[PDB]
Design a protein around this ligand. Structure first.
Ligand SMILES: Cc1cn([C@H]2C[C@H](O)[C@@H](COP(=O)(O)O)O2)c(=O)[nH]c1=O
Ligand SMILES: Cc1cn([C@H]2C[C@H](OP(=O)(O)O)[C@@H](CO)O2)c(=O)[nH]c1=O
Length: 563
């Protein structure tokens, strides 16, 4: 009679139900339903996957989920068709697969609808032409879960034996920790170096103040390394005659950033709002499931024609023609953007204050990215003083452009304003001011700028950045203090062990290559079991070698021997 539609959560069921007619009956599975718990039955059972019997698995219904299973089956018989409207990512394809497996029935009974936002039009087109479940994406998702399970359950026991009980190892988690350990060690080994700068405050012919910075001496960059050198330079500069060597006036511009993707969202939310990766991703999700923003797991800065056309109309009505570019800006699935540009952060219904703030950030970035650039009149004055050359920078805002959508400025607005001076003009020295500085050590990773580092290295993945970040934290390898990452001693002890006995597993390129391999499975360019066999072959040669006595090249035990 009617159609059954399955989503993964109550919040999502409610939202999507506003856009589905009486023919459809929405029901949230309210969870994952089914999942995982030279052989050794012992291991296979705990893992729920069997590397020695072509990877057959044993999925089991979750606790208290039996009522849900049975509640779906009967609803399935009273429906003519079944639509799996899980989220568009691989994990979402696997969950759909599990629902289809559990409920059973002809495959023709099922359809897999895809949408990256829950709006009337997005839902309409999603159920207009519903595609089929994609087994390749499912295999790509399970291949990941399998190798993750293998490393965790087969490396961890070795760590208990060799280092300490309760420790964990993670295919990617251990690589993420490595980045933190290397960073921790760069910092511990840094030797701050001394270097000086010299500023000069002068007077234009009119008498207006002009501040300068010494740049060259004898046509060579100026950078003394001690107090004596600066003084010698200072004595020459006190007697020198100053004059404007050259004035270069040129117009500059600044462009709006591209619309957000998972990683950039996390960084900006962390840098501007002080939100950790977990917080940002939990609010993003609720915004998404409430129908306010597009899917929050993406690495595409692409924007649909309608989205661009709706925002351009908003820019045009609320800001004006000079803020609208000739043609739309194209940045090279969709970015994270509001679903309706006319819905303001302040109009959100059941969203807490911070969730509204995240929406605001997303909204502003989206509107800004389709606006014209800001224009500035930049000025660069070069000054000569004996064998010295000095500099003064400054710019004037000519047209705010995209920055009009961002809060009003209030600080060093018009970063420095230079007075009226022409080439050949004479400046009067009023005061010299030398200053001592010291090179700083590399910044400590932040939850977000680590995702950034993970992204740059092709190690992360929109759907895993969050988990990775939190999954390496309560295991005693690294900790977040003052919003920063600190490597624990145990994080170093384990990292060296792994690098020594599991080189390939800890290598950055190989870890990145595995993501490619996973994309290949998803795109029918590689078969999942063969990819897992190869992975396992490489893994077990590493493992057996590590298992041996250290005098055979096995893993070093965490000990300190007697006299
Ligand atoms: C300049 C810079 C900032 N950040 C960050 C992380 C935080 O989001 C923010 C600083 O916040 P914090 O002072 O609370 O640590 O800027 C980096 O991660 N790397 C950098 O190089
Ligand atoms: C869930 C998931 C998605 N993705 C990527 C690949 C997916 O495209 P394909 O699965 O390549 O369509 C896309 C789903 O949003 O994001 C990953 O790389 N890893 C994951 O674990």
């Amino acid at each position: 009679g009617k159609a059954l539609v399955i989503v993964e959560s109550p919040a999502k069921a409610k939202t999507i139900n506003k856009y589905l007619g009486s023919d459809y009956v929405v029901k949230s599975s309210v969870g994952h339903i089914r999942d995982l718990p030279d052989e050794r039955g012992a291991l296979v059972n705990r893992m729920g996957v069997d590397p020695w019997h072509n990877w057959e698995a044993h999925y089991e219904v979750l606790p208290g989920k039996e009522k849900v299973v049975s509640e779906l089956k009967q609803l399935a018989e009273k429906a003519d068709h079944i639509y799996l409207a899980t989220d568009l990512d691989r994990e979402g394809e696997a969950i759909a697969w599990h629902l289809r497996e559990v409920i059973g029935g002809d495959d023709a009974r099922y359809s897999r609808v895809v949408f990256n936002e829950i709006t009337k039009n997005a839902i309409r087109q999603a159920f207009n032409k519903p595609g089929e479940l994609n087994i390749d994406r499912v295999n790509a998702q399970q291949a990941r879960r399998f190798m993750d399970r293998v490393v965790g359950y087969m490396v961890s026991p070795l760590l208990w034996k060799k280092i300490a009980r309760g420790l964990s190892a993670g295919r990617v988690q251990s690589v993420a920790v490595r980045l933190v350990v290397e960073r921790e060690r760069e910092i511990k080994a840094f030797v701050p170096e001394e270097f000086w700068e010299v500023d000069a405050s002068t007077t234009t012919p009119s008498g207006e103040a002009l501040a300068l910075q010494v740049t060259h001496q004898n046509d060579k960059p100026f950078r003394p390394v001690n107090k004596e050198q600066t003084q010698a330079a200072v004595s020459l500069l006190e007697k020198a005659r100053y004059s404007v060597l050259e004035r270069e006036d040129k117009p500059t511009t600044s462009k709006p950033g591209a619309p957000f993707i998972t990683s950039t969202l996390q960084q900006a939310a962390s840098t501007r709002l002080g939100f950790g990766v977990k917080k940002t991703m939990m609010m993003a999700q609720r915004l998404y499931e409430a129908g306010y923003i597009t899917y929050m797991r993406t690495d595409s800065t692409n924007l649909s024609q309608d989205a661009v056309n709706m925002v351009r109309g908003y820019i045009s009505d609320n800001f004006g023609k000079k803020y609208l570019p000739e043609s739309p800006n194209q940045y090279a699935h969709e970015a994270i953007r509001p679903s309706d540009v006319n819905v303001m952060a302040e109009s959100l219904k059941d969203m807490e204050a911070d969730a509204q703030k995240l929406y605001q950030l997303i909204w502003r970035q989206f509107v800004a990215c389709q606006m014209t650039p800001a224009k500035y009149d930049s000025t660069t004055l070069t000054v000569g003083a004996g064998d010295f050359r000095l500099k003064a920078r400054g710019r004037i805002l000519r047209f705010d452009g995209w920055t009009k959508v961002m809060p009003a400025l209030r600080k060093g607005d018009e970063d420095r304003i230079l007075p009226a001076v022409n080439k050949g003009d004479a400046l009067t020295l009023v005061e010299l001011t030398p200053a001592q500085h010291f090179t700083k050590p590399p910044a400590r990773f932040s939850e977000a700028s680590l995702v950034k580092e993970l992204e740059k290295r092709g190690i992360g993945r929109p759907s895993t950045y969050a988990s990775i970040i939190s999954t390496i934290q309560d295991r005693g390898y690294v900790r977040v203090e003052n919003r920063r990452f600190y490597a624990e001693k145990m994080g170093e002890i384990v990292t060296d062990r792994l690098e020594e006995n599991f080189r390939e597993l800890m290598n950055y390129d190989f870890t990145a290559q595995m993501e490619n391999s996973l994309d290949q499975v998803a795109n029918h360019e590689a078969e999942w079991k063969a990819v897992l066999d190869h992975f396992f072959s490489d893994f077990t040669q590493q493992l057996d070698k590590a298992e041996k006595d250290p005098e055979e090249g096995g893993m070093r035990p965490n000990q300190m021997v007697l006299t």
